[PDB]
Amino acid sequence: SWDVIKHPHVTEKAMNDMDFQNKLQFAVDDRASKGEVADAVEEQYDVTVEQVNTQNTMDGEKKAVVRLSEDDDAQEVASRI
Amino acid sequence: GKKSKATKKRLAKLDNQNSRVPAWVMLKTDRRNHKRRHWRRNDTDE
Amino acid sequence: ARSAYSYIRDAWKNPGDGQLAELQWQRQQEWRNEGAVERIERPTRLDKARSQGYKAKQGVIVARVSVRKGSARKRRHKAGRRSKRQGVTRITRRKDIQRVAEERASRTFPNLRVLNSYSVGQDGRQKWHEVILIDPNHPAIQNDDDLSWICADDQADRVFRGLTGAGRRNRGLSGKGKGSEKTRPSLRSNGGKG
Amino acid sequence: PVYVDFDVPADLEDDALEALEVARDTGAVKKGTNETTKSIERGSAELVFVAEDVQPEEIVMHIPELADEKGVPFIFVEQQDDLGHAAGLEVGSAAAAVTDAGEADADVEDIADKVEELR
Amino acid sequence: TVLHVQEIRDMTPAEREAELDDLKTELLNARAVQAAGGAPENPGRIKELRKAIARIKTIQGEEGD
RNA sequence: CGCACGGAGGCGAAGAACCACAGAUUUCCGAAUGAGAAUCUCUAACAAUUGCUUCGCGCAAUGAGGAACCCCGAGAACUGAAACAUCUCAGUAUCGGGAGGAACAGAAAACGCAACGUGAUGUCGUUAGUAACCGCGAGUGAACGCGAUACAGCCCAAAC
RNA sequence: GAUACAGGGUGACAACCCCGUACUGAAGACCAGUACGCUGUGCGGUAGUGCCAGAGUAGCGGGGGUUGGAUAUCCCUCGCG
Ligand SMILES: [Cl-]
Ligand SMILES: [Cl-]
Ligand SMILES: [K+]
Ligand SMILES: [Mg+2]
Ligand SMILES: [Mg+2]
Ligand SMILES: [Mg+2]
Ligand SMILES: [Mg+2]
Ligand SMILES: [Mg+2]
Ligand SMILES: [Mg+2]
Ligand SMILES: [Mg+2]
Ligand SMILES: [Mg+2]
Ligand SMILES: [Mg+2]
Ligand code: NA
Ligand code: NA
Ligand code: NA
Ligand code: NA
Ligand code: NA
Ligand code: NA
Ligand code: NA
Ligand code: NA
Ligand code: NA
Ligand code: NA
Ligand SMILES: [Sr+2]
Ligand SMILES: [Sr+2]
Ligand SMILES: [Sr+2]
Ligand SMILES: [Sr+2]
Ligand SMILES: [Sr+2]
Ligand SMILES: [Sr+2]
Numbered sequence: 001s002w003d004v005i006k007h008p009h010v011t012e013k014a015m016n017d018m019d020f021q022n023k024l025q026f027a028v029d030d031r032a033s034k035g036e037v038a039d040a041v042e043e044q045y046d047v048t049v050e051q052v053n054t055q056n057t058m059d060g061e062k063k064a065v066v067r068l069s070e071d072d073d074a075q076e077v078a079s080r081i
Numbered sequence: 082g083k084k085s086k087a088t089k090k091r092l093a094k095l096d097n098q099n100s101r102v103p104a105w106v107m108l109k110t111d112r113r114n115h116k117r118r119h120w121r122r123n124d125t126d127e
Numbered sequence: 128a129r130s131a132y133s134y135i136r137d138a139w140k141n142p143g144d145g146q147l148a149e150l151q152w153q154r155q156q157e158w159r160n161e162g163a164v165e166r167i168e169r170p171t172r173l174d175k176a177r178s179q180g181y182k183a184k185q186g187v188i189v190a191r192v193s194v195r196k197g198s199a200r201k202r203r204h205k206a207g208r209r210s211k212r213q214g215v216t217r218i219t220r221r222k223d224i225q226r227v228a229e230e231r232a233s234r235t236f237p238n239l240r241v242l243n244s245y246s247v248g249q250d251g252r253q254k255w256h257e258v259i260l261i262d263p264n265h266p267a268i269q270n271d272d273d274l275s276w277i278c279a280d281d282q283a284d285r286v287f288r289g290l291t292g293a294g295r296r297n298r299g300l301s302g303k304g305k306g307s308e309k310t311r312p313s314l315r316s317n318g319g320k321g
Numbered sequence: 322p323v324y325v326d327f328d329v330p331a332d333l334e335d336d337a338l339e340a341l342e343v344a345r346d347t348g349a350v351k352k353g354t355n356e357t358t359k360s361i362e363r364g365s366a367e368l369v370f371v372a373e374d375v376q377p378e379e380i381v382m383h384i385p386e387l388a389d390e391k392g393v394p395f396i397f398v399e400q401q402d403d404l405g406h407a408a409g410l411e412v413g414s415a416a417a418a419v420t421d422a423g424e425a426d427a428d429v430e431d432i433a434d435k436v437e438e439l440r
Numbered sequence: 441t442v443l444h445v446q447e448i449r450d451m452t453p454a455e456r457e458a459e460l461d462d463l464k465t466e467l468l469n470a471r472a473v474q475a476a477g478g479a480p481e482n483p484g485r486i487k488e489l490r491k492a493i494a495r496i497k498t499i500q501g502e503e504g505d
Numbered sequence: 506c507g508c509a510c511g512g513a514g515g516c517g518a519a520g521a522a523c524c525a526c527a528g529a530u531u532u533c534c535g536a537a538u539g540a541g542a543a544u545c546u547c548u549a550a551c552a553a554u555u556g557c558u559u560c561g562c563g564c565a566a567u568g569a570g571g572a573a574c575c576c577c578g579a580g581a582a583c584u585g586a587a588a589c590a591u592c593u594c595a596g597u598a599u600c601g602g603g604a605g606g607a608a609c610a611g612a613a614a615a616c617g618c619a620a621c622g623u624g625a626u627g628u629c630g631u632u633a634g635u636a637a638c639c640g641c642g643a644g645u646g647a648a649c650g651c652g653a654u655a656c657a658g659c660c661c662a663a664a665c
Numbered sequence: 666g667a668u669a670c671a672g673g674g675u676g677a678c679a680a681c682c683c684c685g686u687a688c689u690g691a692a693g694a695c696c697a698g699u700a701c702g703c704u705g706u707g708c709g710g711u712a713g714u715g716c717c718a719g720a721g722u723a724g725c726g727g728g729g730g731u732u733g734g735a736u737a738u739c740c741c742u743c744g745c746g
Contacts, residue, residue: 002532003464005468006471007468007471007472007474007475008472008475009475010472010475010476031532044465044468056086056089057093058089058092058093058096059093059097060089060090060093060094081468081469081472085542085543085545086545086546087542087543087544087545088543088545090544090545091544103511104511105511105512106509106511107511108510108511108512109509109510109511109512110508110509110510110511111509111510126543127543128358128359128362128363128664128716128717129358129359129362129663129664129716129717130355130358130359130662130663130664130717131354131355131357131358131359131380131383132355132662132663133663133717134358134382134383134387135379135380135382136719136720138379138382138383139379139720139721140720140721140722141720141721141746142721146323146324146378146382147379147382149323150323150378150379153323166555169376169377170377171377171379172377172379173377173379173380174662174663174719175719175720177661177662177663177719178661178662178663178719179662179719180661180662185556185557185558186556186557188555188556196743197742197743198728198729198741198742198743199741199742206581206582207581207582208581208582209590210590210591211590211591212581214729214730217728217729217742218729218730218741218742219728219729219730219740219741219742220578220579220740220741220742221577221578221579221730221731221740221741222577222578222740222741223740223741223742224741224742226577226578230577230578230602234554235554235555236554236555236556236567237553237554237555237566237567237568238554238555238556238565238566238567239555239556239566245720246720246721248721260556262555262556262557262565262566263566264556264557264565264566265556265557265565265566266557267557272660273660273661274661276660280604280605281604281605281608282604283603283604283605284602284603284604285603285604286577286603287576287577287578287602287603287604288575288576288577288602288603288604288608288609289576289577289578289603289609290576290577290604290609294577295610297740297741298577298739298740299738299739299740300610302613302614302615302739303611303613303614303615303616303625304613304615304616304648304649305615305616305648305649305734305737305738306732306734306737306738306739307738307739308647308648308732308733308734308738308739309647309731309732309733309738309739310738310739310740311609311610311611311626311627312609312610312611312626312627313575313576313577313608313609313610314576314577314596314609314739315575315576315577315609316575316576316609316610318595318596318597319580319595319596319731320596320731320732320733320738320739321731321732321738321739321740441515441516444519445519446519481513481514482514482515483513483514483515484506484514484515484516485514485515487506487514487515487516488515488516494530497529497530498529498530501529501530502528502529
């Protein structure tokens with residue numbers, strides 16, 4: 001069975017969303033929906049996801065931009081992992 | 082032209098096939114990419 | 128004494144005289160309106176069916192078939208074929224109507240194998256034949272001392288390969304001695320001069 | 322329906338099958354067209370039955386003319402399974418026969434005569 | 441090196457199901473450091489982590505569930 | 506710790522690598538079978554055709570592949586005849602259907618070295634370029650027998 | 666040395682450096698669910714009896730095709746039987 005979250009997308013623009021807009025970027029499995037990416041991020045990091053924006057990258061993988069709520073901080077999540 | 086999901090997955094792989102033989106393979110075999118494609122001179126599928 | 132079966136056999140010796148004459152005039156009216164291949168519960172000729180191998184068992188099917196009459200539905204020549212190779216309505220085929228009938232019937236039933244067939248009459252535009260079919264996978268036949276041969280892997284699609292009784296007769300394999308040098312063991316092995 | 326030259330009434334048919342029902346509980350009967358034909362040929366048939374719903378008709382066709390050239394009386398039954406249950410079978414019979422009735426001979430004599438009156 | 445065949449058969453269908461996650465997370469936490477290209481890599485563990493998750497999934501089918 | 510001699514790191518006496526056998530896993534498209542689709546998507550699926558049937562897709566069958574071989578069908582022209590039409594090329598090419606590890610054939614309504622004889626079927630040798638055919642031209646061409654290989658002989662329909 | 670002087674390897678021409686090679690022995694497949702054996706069954710003979718033994722068939726005629734098949738090849742087709 002396939003896993004949703006593969007690995008985090010850690011690029012310079014992935015920081016411009018982490019610092020400024022409180023968003024965590026992951027490169028997920030292409031068969032996953034915005035609702036499946038949402039539940040998956042919560043069940044692995046104990047956070048609260050408000051919005052998920054997807055894009056099908058030119059690498060065949062799916063890039064998921066996950067926005068957290070004010071109660072959780074993106075800069076603080078990227079530290080432990 | 083509007084590409085579909087699969088068409089994208091394919092054109093994506095073809096781009097990774099355009100990467101050179103890494104520096105270490107030369108040092109391991111003790112001394113050529115044959116699927117060398119150009120965006121102008123060559124033709125892909127579809 | 129005579130069998131009740133022998134009274135159907137003796138009737139079919141002349142399918143245009145008496146009781147059978149009035150029967151076939153009636154039946155064909157419904158048959159002309161019936162399809163190409165119609166599965167029928169009971170055969171029209173009991174003696175003939177039983178003689179060919181039919182039993183009143185589970186997995187022993189009978190089906191009537193109707194094929195067009197005459198010669199070949201042969202066209203003309205598009206590309207340059209000589210005077211000799213230009214006959215349109217004067218030439219016929221190498222498989223008799225009974226063989227087409229058996230094949231059409233085995234394709235209608237893609238799991239059942241052809242046992243044998245017989246004629247059930249004809250009118251001006253078509254010929255009717257009833258084909259006995261057997262289910263090779265039914266245990267009712269798998270343990271039958273008189274029919275379990277038809278369940279062998281090598282008997283699969285036996286009509287299409289001409290291994291039918293109707294098949295071997297058209298292939299010119301009836302005679303054991305003279306005029307059967309080009310027909311036995313097979314036509315293809317003898318270069319097709321049968 | 323082609324081998325039938327006369328319609329046998331329901332009232333007479335009830336009287337005919339009742340006689341067959343007691344013929345298996347006393348003497349002997351013949352169940353199945355093959356055994357009934359040999360009965361007419363061997364002469365051992367007293368009264369022969371024939372079903373009217375036999376498809377194909379060929380299995381029966383001979384019975385009306387055979388029973389006539391052998392003097393053996395015949396009678397028509399509408400349904401196949403009615404004659405089947407009457408012979409004492411679970412299935413159905415196309416034609417039945419009575420070989421030496423037994424405690425029915427006082428009715429078979431009349432059934433055979435009620436058919437001659439009906440031609 | 442750390443997880444052998446015997447040590448997996450000495451577990452319960454609930455200890456394996458929990459060891460699965462404890463390795464599946466360790467993998468994602470190794471794959472994340474490989475996403476940044478960081479130097480504190482241990483090339484042998486990331487390979488053996490796959491082999492381990494495979495072993496536990498294999499034994500899981502073998503033991504009923 | 507493949508090809509493939511790097512770097513780094515790892516595994517191995519808890520007996521690894523490697524190999525033999527059995528098994529686990531085995532994405533999607535694919536006969537492709539819930540429906541549609543350029544390998545994707547859409548709201549429970551033997552789709553289709555059959556058999557049996559508890560008449561419910563409940564139990565089953567077919568589908569497609571494989572170098573060639575095999576069996577049943579369809580069936581050319583160049584070419585040869587010093588042209589060409591019957592004939593030849595040739596039942597060759599190619600096409601439609603189908604089976605198996607082989608296929609097909611097969612236990613005489615036979616043979617007819619006519620006998621007081623042989624005794625299922627393939628195949629090999631020979632019979633023989635014979636008999637036979639043919640604008641009697643070019644060409645086409647068996648068989649019975651014989652010697653060998655291998656051997657094997659049975660089952661219904663009906664009567665009762 | 667040799668029941669081993671087939672072959673290859675090895676920094677040059679190797680039976681005795683190395684793999685192998687002879688001899689001997691082990692496994693699988695195939696032969697083959699065959700042969701052999703066994704189990705059940707029952708082979709056979711005499712006289713009496715016109716009870717039974719497969720139809721559009723055997724065969725004939727017209728048209729086609731094919732064959733070495735010549736009147737005497739096999740086949741399809743229409744009619745008759
Ligand atoms: Cl078939
Ligand atoms: Cl002889
Ligand atoms: K020509
Ligand atoms: Mg989008
Ligand atoms: Mg690039
Ligand atoms: Mg052959
Ligand atoms: Mg589909
Ligand atoms: Mg010429
Ligand atoms: Mg010719
Ligand atoms: Mg000339
Ligand atoms: Mg020729
Ligand atoms: Mg001869
Ligand atoms: Na281009
Ligand atoms: Na079939
Ligand atoms: Na990546
Ligand atoms: Na596999
Ligand atoms: Na069903
Ligand atoms: Na010439
Ligand atoms: Na010319
Ligand atoms: Na000529
Ligand atoms: Na021929
Ligand atoms: Na003819
Ligand atoms: Sr990229
Ligand atoms: Sr161009
Ligand atoms: Sr019935
Ligand atoms: Sr098939
Ligand atoms: Sr022999
Ligand atoms: Sr006979």
